[PDB]
Amino acid sequence: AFDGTWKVDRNENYEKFMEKMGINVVKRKLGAHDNLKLTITQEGNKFTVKESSNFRNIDNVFELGVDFAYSLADGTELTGTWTMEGNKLVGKFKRVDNGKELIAVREISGNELIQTYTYEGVEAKRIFKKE
């Protein structure tokens, strides 16, 4: 399942996605090489995702079907929820400042974790390998 540690391995069109979000050239390059690592543990319907990178180290906790607030490394705030369909996690979010929609998907492909994002007509992915 999702249990365990995962290390980012490669990105697809991630810089274009950050540009649409309004991030400048310098900060986009730093974001693309963030050394992101995720540690996931489950407890019933409750997930704890430990996020560790060159920017910060925080713990994100949520319950399926219950909305919560989340902040990006640049200060941008979001609100939304995650649900479980099939063997995938699907999340629907909204930017708190301009109100635009943002979708994310997490699924397992062999021994790799694939995370997909969609924002204002642009799609990007980040692929993690299991520790």
mmCIF file of all heavy atoms in Angstrom, residues 20-61:
data_model
loop_
_atom_site.group_PDB
_atom_site.id
_atom_site.type_symbol
_atom_site.label_atom_id
_atom_site.label_comp_id
_atom_site.label_asym_id
_atom_site.label_seq_id
_atom_site.Cartn_x
_atom_site.Cartn_y
_atom_site.Cartn_z
ATOM 1 N N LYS A 20 2.857 28.848 -13.802
ATOM 2 C CA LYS A 20 1.438 29.195 -13.874
ATOM 3 C C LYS A 20 0.950 29.652 -12.492
ATOM 4 O O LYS A 20 0.076 30.516 -12.381
ATOM 5 C CB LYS A 20 0.632 27.979 -14.340
ATOM 6 C CG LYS A 20 -0.805 28.265 -14.731
ATOM 7 C CD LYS A 20 -0.877 29.133 -15.981
ATOM 8 C CE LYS A 20 -2.321 29.379 -16.408
ATOM 9 N NZ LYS A 20 -2.402 30.259 -17.606
ATOM 10 N N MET A 21 1.524 29.066 -11.443
ATOM 11 C CA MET A 21 1.168 29.399 -10.062
ATOM 12 C C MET A 21 1.692 30.781 -9.664
ATOM 13 O O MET A 21 1.289 31.332 -8.638
ATOM 14 C CB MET A 21 1.726 28.335 -9.102
ATOM 15 C CG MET A 21 1.041 26.963 -9.183
ATOM 16 S SD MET A 21 -0.521 26.814 -8.232
ATOM 17 C CE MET A 21 0.102 26.860 -6.558
ATOM 18 N N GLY A 22 2.599 31.329 -10.468
ATOM 19 C CA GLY A 22 3.144 32.648 -10.183
ATOM 20 C C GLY A 22 4.513 32.698 -9.515
ATOM 21 O O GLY A 22 4.897 33.744 -8.979
ATOM 22 N N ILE A 23 5.255 31.592 -9.559
ATOM 23 C CA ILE A 23 6.583 31.497 -8.941
ATOM 24 C C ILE A 23 7.670 31.916 -9.947
ATOM 25 O O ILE A 23 7.613 31.522 -11.117
ATOM 26 C CB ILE A 23 6.804 30.043 -8.441
ATOM 27 C CG1 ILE A 23 5.669 29.672 -7.470
ATOM 28 C CG2 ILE A 23 8.165 29.903 -7.780
ATOM 29 C CD1 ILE A 23 5.650 28.237 -7.021
ATOM 30 N N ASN A 24 8.655 32.702 -9.500
ATOM 31 C CA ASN A 24 9.696 33.190 -10.412
ATOM 32 C C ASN A 24 10.772 32.176 -10.783
ATOM 33 O O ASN A 24 10.916 31.130 -10.141
ATOM 34 C CB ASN A 24 10.365 34.480 -9.885
ATOM 35 C CG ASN A 24 11.297 34.237 -8.702
ATOM 36 O OD1 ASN A 24 12.158 33.356 -8.735
ATOM 37 N ND2 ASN A 24 11.149 35.048 -7.662
ATOM 38 N N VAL A 25 11.533 32.506 -11.823
ATOM 39 C CA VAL A 25 12.570 31.621 -12.325
ATOM 40 C C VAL A 25 13.516 31.072 -11.258
ATOM 41 O O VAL A 25 13.765 29.868 -11.229
ATOM 42 C CB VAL A 25 13.392 32.299 -13.460
ATOM 43 C CG1 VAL A 25 14.187 33.467 -12.923
ATOM 44 C CG2 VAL A 25 14.307 31.280 -14.114
ATOM 45 N N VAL A 26 14.031 31.926 -10.376
ATOM 46 C CA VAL A 26 14.947 31.454 -9.331
ATOM 47 C C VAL A 26 14.302 30.453 -8.368
ATOM 48 O O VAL A 26 14.852 29.374 -8.128
ATOM 49 C CB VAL A 26 15.542 32.634 -8.504
ATOM 50 C CG1 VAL A 26 16.434 32.097 -7.391
ATOM 51 C CG2 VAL A 26 16.361 33.543 -9.402
ATOM 52 N N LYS A 27 13.136 30.794 -7.824
ATOM 53 C CA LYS A 27 12.464 29.895 -6.888
ATOM 54 C C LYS A 27 11.944 28.610 -7.542
ATOM 55 O O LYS A 27 11.699 27.624 -6.848
ATOM 56 C CB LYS A 27 11.307 30.609 -6.188
ATOM 57 C CG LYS A 27 11.694 31.876 -5.441
ATOM 58 C CD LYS A 27 12.805 31.645 -4.429
ATOM 59 C CE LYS A 27 13.146 32.949 -3.720
ATOM 60 N NZ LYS A 27 14.327 32.824 -2.824
ATOM 61 N N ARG A 28 11.752 28.621 -8.863
ATOM 62 C CA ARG A 28 11.287 27.418 -9.555
ATOM 63 C C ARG A 28 12.412 26.391 -9.635
ATOM 64 O O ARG A 28 12.162 25.187 -9.556
ATOM 65 C CB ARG A 28 10.794 27.724 -10.980
ATOM 66 C CG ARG A 28 9.505 28.525 -11.056
ATOM 67 C CD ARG A 28 8.867 28.373 -12.431
ATOM 68 N NE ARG A 28 9.661 28.907 -13.538
ATOM 69 C CZ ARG A 28 9.643 30.172 -13.956
ATOM 70 N NH1 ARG A 28 8.866 31.075 -13.373
ATOM 71 N NH2 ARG A 28 10.398 30.534 -14.981
ATOM 72 N N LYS A 29 13.644 26.873 -9.808
ATOM 73 C CA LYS A 29 14.817 25.996 -9.882
ATOM 74 C C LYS A 29 15.110 25.376 -8.521
ATOM 75 O O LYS A 29 15.537 24.227 -8.432
ATOM 76 C CB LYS A 29 16.050 26.776 -10.361
ATOM 77 C CG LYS A 29 15.957 27.299 -11.790
ATOM 78 C CD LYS A 29 15.851 26.158 -12.792
ATOM 79 C CE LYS A 29 15.751 26.691 -14.219
ATOM 80 N NZ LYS A 29 15.512 25.606 -15.218
ATOM 81 N N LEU A 30 14.889 26.140 -7.459
ATOM 82 C CA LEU A 30 15.120 25.630 -6.111
ATOM 83 C C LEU A 30 14.049 24.583 -5.777
ATOM 84 O O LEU A 30 14.320 23.587 -5.105
ATOM 85 C CB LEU A 30 15.070 26.779 -5.096
ATOM 86 C CG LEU A 30 16.075 27.928 -5.274
ATOM 87 C CD1 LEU A 30 15.828 28.995 -4.215
ATOM 88 C CD2 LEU A 30 17.508 27.399 -5.178
ATOM 89 N N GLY A 31 12.832 24.812 -6.259
ATOM 90 C CA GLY A 31 11.742 23.887 -6.002
ATOM 91 C C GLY A 31 11.904 22.572 -6.739
ATOM 92 O O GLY A 31 11.507 21.521 -6.237
ATOM 93 N N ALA A 32 12.485 22.624 -7.934
ATOM 94 C CA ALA A 32 12.687 21.415 -8.728
ATOM 95 C C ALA A 32 13.762 20.486 -8.147
ATOM 96 O O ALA A 32 13.755 19.289 -8.434
ATOM 97 C CB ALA A 32 13.039 21.787 -10.168
ATOM 98 N N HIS A 33 14.681 21.028 -7.345
ATOM 99 C CA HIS A 33 15.738 20.219 -6.716
ATOM 100 C C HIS A 33 15.631 20.323 -5.200
ATOM 101 O O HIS A 33 16.601 20.671 -4.530
ATOM 102 C CB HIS A 33 17.138 20.696 -7.124
ATOM 103 C CG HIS A 33 17.411 20.607 -8.588
ATOM 104 N ND1 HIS A 33 17.081 21.613 -9.472
ATOM 105 C CD2 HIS A 33 17.970 19.622 -9.333
ATOM 106 C CE1 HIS A 33 17.427 21.253 -10.697
ATOM 107 N NE2 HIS A 33 17.967 20.051 -10.638
ATOM 108 N N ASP A 34 14.458 19.995 -4.661
ATOM 109 C CA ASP A 34 14.221 20.106 -3.229
ATOM 110 C C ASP A 34 14.568 18.891 -2.363
ATOM 111 O O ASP A 34 14.477 18.970 -1.141
ATOM 112 C CB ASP A 34 12.757 20.507 -2.995
ATOM 113 C CG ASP A 34 11.764 19.488 -3.556
ATOM 114 O OD1 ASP A 34 12.193 18.508 -4.217
ATOM 115 O OD2 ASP A 34 10.550 19.674 -3.341
ATOM 116 N N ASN A 35 14.978 17.783 -2.980
ATOM 117 C CA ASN A 35 15.313 16.570 -2.226
ATOM 118 C C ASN A 35 14.149 16.094 -1.353
ATOM 119 O O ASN A 35 14.365 15.618 -0.238
ATOM 120 C CB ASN A 35 16.528 16.806 -1.320
ATOM 121 C CG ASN A 35 17.803 16.206 -1.876
ATOM 122 O OD1 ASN A 35 17.911 14.985 -2.043
ATOM 123 N ND2 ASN A 35 18.782 17.058 -2.160
ATOM 124 N N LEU A 36 12.927 16.207 -1.862
ATOM 125 C CA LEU A 36 11.741 15.807 -1.108
ATOM 126 C C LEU A 36 11.690 14.321 -0.728
ATOM 127 O O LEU A 36 11.951 13.433 -1.546
ATOM 128 C CB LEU A 36 10.472 16.174 -1.886
ATOM 129 C CG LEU A 36 9.128 15.883 -1.195
ATOM 130 C CD1 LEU A 36 8.962 16.754 0.060
ATOM 131 C CD2 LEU A 36 7.995 16.153 -2.178
ATOM 132 N N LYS A 37 11.337 14.079 0.529
ATOM 133 C CA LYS A 37 11.208 12.739 1.088
ATOM 134 C C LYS A 37 9.890 12.681 1.857
ATOM 135 O O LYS A 37 9.571 13.606 2.606
ATOM 136 C CB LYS A 37 12.370 12.456 2.040
ATOM 137 C CG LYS A 37 12.263 11.135 2.778
ATOM 138 C CD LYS A 37 13.367 10.998 3.811
ATOM 139 C CE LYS A 37 13.165 9.758 4.681
ATOM 140 N NZ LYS A 37 14.225 9.613 5.732
ATOM 141 N N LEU A 38 9.129 11.604 1.666
ATOM 142 C CA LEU A 38 7.844 11.424 2.353
ATOM 143 C C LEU A 38 7.786 10.121 3.162
ATOM 144 O O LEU A 38 8.143 9.054 2.660
ATOM 145 C CB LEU A 38 6.687 11.401 1.341
ATOM 146 C CG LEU A 38 6.430 12.550 0.355
ATOM 147 C CD1 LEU A 38 5.297 12.123 -0.574
ATOM 148 C CD2 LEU A 38 6.071 13.848 1.080
ATOM 149 N N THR A 39 7.328 10.212 4.407
ATOM 150 C CA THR A 39 7.178 9.041 5.278
ATOM 151 C C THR A 39 5.682 8.935 5.605
ATOM 152 O O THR A 39 5.123 9.796 6.276
ATOM 153 C CB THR A 39 7.972 9.204 6.586
ATOM 154 O OG1 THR A 39 9.365 9.350 6.281
ATOM 155 C CG2 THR A 39 7.778 7.986 7.482
ATOM 156 N N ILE A 40 5.045 7.870 5.140
ATOM 157 C CA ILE A 40 3.610 7.708 5.331
ATOM 158 C C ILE A 40 3.202 6.551 6.239
ATOM 159 O O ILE A 40 3.678 5.432 6.086
ATOM 160 C CB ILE A 40 2.923 7.531 3.948
ATOM 161 C CG1 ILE A 40 3.242 8.743 3.062
ATOM 162 C CG2 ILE A 40 1.416 7.359 4.116
ATOM 163 C CD1 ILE A 40 2.736 8.623 1.626
ATOM 164 N N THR A 41 2.322 6.839 7.194
ATOM 165 C CA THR A 41 1.814 5.820 8.105
ATOM 166 C C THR A 41 0.308 6.017 8.185
ATOM 167 O O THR A 41 -0.188 7.146 8.108
ATOM 168 C CB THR A 41 2.413 5.935 9.526
ATOM 169 O OG1 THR A 41 1.962 7.140 10.146
ATOM 170 C CG2 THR A 41 3.929 5.950 9.461
ATOM 171 N N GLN A 42 -0.418 4.913 8.325
ATOM 172 C CA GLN A 42 -1.872 4.958 8.392
ATOM 173 C C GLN A 42 -2.371 4.464 9.752
ATOM 174 O O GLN A 42 -1.736 3.624 10.396
ATOM 175 C CB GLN A 42 -2.471 4.089 7.280
ATOM 176 C CG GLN A 42 -3.912 4.413 6.955
ATOM 177 C CD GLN A 42 -4.554 3.405 6.025
ATOM 178 O OE1 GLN A 42 -3.962 2.986 5.032
ATOM 179 N NE2 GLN A 42 -5.787 3.029 6.331
ATOM 180 N N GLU A 43 -3.510 4.991 10.185
ATOM 181 C CA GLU A 43 -4.099 4.602 11.457
ATOM 182 C C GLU A 43 -5.604 4.734 11.272
ATOM 183 O O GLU A 43 -6.192 5.769 11.583
ATOM 184 C CB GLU A 43 -3.598 5.534 12.558
ATOM 185 C CG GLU A 43 -3.977 5.132 13.959
ATOM 186 C CD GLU A 43 -3.377 6.064 14.991
ATOM 187 O OE1 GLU A 43 -3.726 7.262 14.980
ATOM 188 O OE2 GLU A 43 -2.549 5.601 15.805
ATOM 189 N N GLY A 44 -6.217 3.680 10.744
ATOM 190 C CA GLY A 44 -7.644 3.710 10.482
ATOM 191 C C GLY A 44 -7.843 4.574 9.255
ATOM 192 O O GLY A 44 -7.194 4.352 8.232
ATOM 193 N N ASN A 45 -8.722 5.564 9.361
ATOM 194 C CA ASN A 45 -9.002 6.496 8.264
ATOM 195 C C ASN A 45 -8.106 7.730 8.355
ATOM 196 O O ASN A 45 -8.294 8.693 7.613
ATOM 197 C CB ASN A 45 -10.456 6.976 8.325
ATOM 198 C CG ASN A 45 -11.367 6.230 7.379
ATOM 199 O OD1 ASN A 45 -12.575 6.478 7.351
ATOM 200 N ND2 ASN A 45 -10.801 5.324 6.588
ATOM 201 N N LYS A 46 -7.135 7.687 9.260
ATOM 202 C CA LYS A 46 -6.240 8.814 9.505
ATOM 203 C C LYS A 46 -4.802 8.597 9.012
ATOM 204 O O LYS A 46 -4.140 7.636 9.406
ATOM 205 C CB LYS A 46 -6.263 9.089 11.008
ATOM 206 C CG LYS A 46 -5.543 10.315 11.505
ATOM 207 C CD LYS A 46 -5.841 10.425 13.003
ATOM 208 C CE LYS A 46 -5.237 11.646 13.644
ATOM 209 N NZ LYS A 46 -5.628 11.690 15.081
ATOM 210 N N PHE A 47 -4.332 9.504 8.155
ATOM 211 C CA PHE A 47 -2.980 9.440 7.598
ATOM 212 C C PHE A 47 -2.070 10.536 8.136
ATOM 213 O O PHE A 47 -2.489 11.678 8.330
ATOM 214 C CB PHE A 47 -2.984 9.599 6.069
ATOM 215 C CG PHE A 47 -3.553 8.434 5.317
ATOM 216 C CD1 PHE A 47 -4.903 8.126 5.389
ATOM 217 C CD2 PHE A 47 -2.726 7.648 4.511
ATOM 218 C CE1 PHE A 47 -5.431 7.051 4.671
ATOM 219 C CE2 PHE A 47 -3.248 6.571 3.789
ATOM 220 C CZ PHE A 47 -4.603 6.274 3.871
ATOM 221 N N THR A 48 -0.814 10.181 8.359
ATOM 222 C CA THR A 48 0.181 11.136 8.806
ATOM 223 C C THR A 48 1.251 11.119 7.727
ATOM 224 O O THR A 48 1.860 10.080 7.472
ATOM 225 C CB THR A 48 0.815 10.730 10.149
ATOM 226 O OG1 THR A 48 -0.161 10.854 11.193
ATOM 227 C CG2 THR A 48 2.020 11.616 10.463
ATOM 228 N N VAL A 49 1.455 12.253 7.067
ATOM 229 C CA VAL A 49 2.475 12.337 6.028
ATOM 230 C C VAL A 49 3.576 13.290 6.481
ATOM 231 O O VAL A 49 3.357 14.498 6.566
ATOM 232 C CB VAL A 49 1.901 12.868 4.685
ATOM 233 C CG1 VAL A 49 2.995 12.887 3.636
ATOM 234 C CG2 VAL A 49 0.738 12.001 4.213
ATOM 235 N N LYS A 50 4.747 12.748 6.798
ATOM 236 C CA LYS A 50 5.873 13.574 7.215
ATOM 237 C C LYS A 50 6.597 14.072 5.970
ATOM 238 O O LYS A 50 7.065 13.282 5.148
ATOM 239 C CB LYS A 50 6.842 12.780 8.089
ATOM 240 C CG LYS A 50 6.274 12.383 9.437
ATOM 241 C CD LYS A 50 7.299 11.608 10.252
ATOM 242 C CE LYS A 50 6.769 11.277 11.631
ATOM 243 N NZ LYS A 50 6.507 12.520 12.418
ATOM 244 N N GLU A 51 6.687 15.389 5.846
ATOM 245 C CA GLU A 51 7.325 16.020 4.705
ATOM 246 C C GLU A 51 8.694 16.580 5.108
ATOM 247 O O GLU A 51 8.797 17.395 6.028
ATOM 248 C CB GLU A 51 6.411 17.133 4.192
ATOM 249 C CG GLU A 51 6.829 17.766 2.882
ATOM 250 C CD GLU A 51 5.949 18.952 2.516
ATOM 251 O OE1 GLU A 51 4.711 18.795 2.483
ATOM 252 O OE2 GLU A 51 6.497 20.041 2.257
ATOM 253 N N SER A 52 9.738 16.137 4.416
ATOM 254 C CA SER A 52 11.109 16.573 4.699
ATOM 255 C C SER A 52 11.848 16.973 3.424
ATOM 256 O O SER A 52 11.976 16.161 2.506
ATOM 257 C CB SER A 52 11.869 15.438 5.388
ATOM 258 O OG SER A 52 13.242 15.750 5.500
ATOM 259 N N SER A 53 12.344 18.211 3.374
ATOM 260 C CA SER A 53 13.063 18.710 2.198
ATOM 261 C C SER A 53 14.095 19.771 2.582
ATOM 262 O O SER A 53 14.339 20.004 3.763
ATOM 263 C CB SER A 53 12.074 19.328 1.209
ATOM 264 O OG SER A 53 11.521 20.526 1.736
ATOM 265 N N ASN A 54 14.697 20.421 1.584
ATOM 266 C CA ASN A 54 15.684 21.467 1.856
ATOM 267 C C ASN A 54 15.019 22.716 2.425
ATOM 268 O O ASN A 54 15.684 23.556 3.033
ATOM 269 C CB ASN A 54 16.459 21.874 0.589
ATOM 270 C CG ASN A 54 17.333 20.758 0.040
ATOM 271 O OD1 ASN A 54 17.952 20.005 0.790
ATOM 272 N ND2 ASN A 54 17.415 20.671 -1.281
ATOM 273 N N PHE A 55 13.707 22.831 2.233
ATOM 274 C CA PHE A 55 12.948 23.986 2.703
ATOM 275 C C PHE A 55 12.386 23.882 4.120
ATOM 276 O O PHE A 55 12.387 24.864 4.868
ATOM 277 C CB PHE A 55 11.772 24.263 1.761
ATOM 278 C CG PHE A 55 12.173 24.644 0.370
ATOM 279 C CD1 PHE A 55 11.793 23.859 -0.716
ATOM 280 C CD2 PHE A 55 12.898 25.805 0.134
ATOM 281 C CE1 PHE A 55 12.124 24.226 -2.017
ATOM 282 C CE2 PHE A 55 13.237 26.186 -1.165
ATOM 283 C CZ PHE A 55 12.847 25.393 -2.243
ATOM 284 N N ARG A 56 11.892 22.706 4.488
ATOM 285 C CA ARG A 56 11.284 22.551 5.801
ATOM 286 C C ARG A 56 11.060 21.092 6.161
ATOM 287 O O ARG A 56 11.297 20.196 5.352
ATOM 288 C CB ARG A 56 9.930 23.268 5.813
ATOM 289 C CG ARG A 56 8.978 22.716 4.753
ATOM 290 C CD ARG A 56 7.625 23.416 4.689
ATOM 291 N NE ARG A 56 6.754 22.755 3.716
ATOM 292 C CZ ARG A 56 5.504 23.119 3.443
ATOM 293 N NH1 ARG A 56 4.955 24.151 4.072
ATOM 294 N NH2 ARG A 56 4.794 22.440 2.547
ATOM 295 N N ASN A 57 10.597 20.873 7.386
ATOM 296 C CA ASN A 57 10.286 19.539 7.885
ATOM 297 C C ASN A 57 9.001 19.678 8.678
ATOM 298 O O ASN A 57 9.010 20.218 9.782
ATOM 299 C CB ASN A 57 11.391 19.006 8.806
ATOM 300 C CG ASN A 57 12.724 18.862 8.103
ATOM 301 O OD1 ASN A 57 13.395 19.845 7.816
ATOM 302 N ND2 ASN A 57 13.104 17.628 7.804
ATOM 303 N N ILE A 58 7.894 19.208 8.116
ATOM 304 C CA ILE A 58 6.614 19.308 8.803
ATOM 305 C C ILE A 58 5.805 18.020 8.738
ATOM 306 O O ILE A 58 6.098 17.128 7.939
ATOM 307 C CB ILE A 58 5.757 20.448 8.221
ATOM 308 C CG1 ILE A 58 5.448 20.168 6.751
ATOM 309 C CG2 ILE A 58 6.502 21.773 8.362
ATOM 310 C CD1 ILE A 58 4.539 21.182 6.121
ATOM 311 N N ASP A 59 4.793 17.935 9.598
ATOM 312 C CA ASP A 59 3.910 16.778 9.665
ATOM 313 C C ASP A 59 2.499 17.178 9.253
ATOM 314 O O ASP A 59 1.893 18.057 9.861
ATOM 315 C CB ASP A 59 3.891 16.210 11.087
ATOM 316 C CG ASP A 59 5.241 15.670 11.512
ATOM 317 O OD1 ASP A 59 6.240 16.415 11.427
ATOM 318 O OD2 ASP A 59 5.307 14.500 11.940
ATOM 319 N N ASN A 60 1.985 16.537 8.210
ATOM 320 C CA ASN A 60 0.643 16.819 7.724
ATOM 321 C C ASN A 60 -0.260 15.653 8.125
ATOM 322 O O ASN A 60 -0.011 14.503 7.750
ATOM 323 C CB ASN A 60 0.659 16.965 6.204
ATOM 324 C CG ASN A 60 1.724 17.930 5.730
ATOM 325 O OD1 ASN A 60 1.751 19.084 6.141
ATOM 326 N ND2 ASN A 60 2.611 17.457 4.857
ATOM 327 N N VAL A 61 -1.310 15.958 8.881
ATOM 328 C CA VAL A 61 -2.238 14.939 9.353
ATOM 329 C C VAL A 61 -3.658 15.219 8.867
ATOM 330 O O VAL A 61 -4.138 16.348 8.965
ATOM 331 C CB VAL A 61 -2.226 14.880 10.905
ATOM 332 C CG1 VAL A 61 -3.136 13.761 11.409
ATOM 333 C CG2 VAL A 61 -0.805 14.667 11.397
#
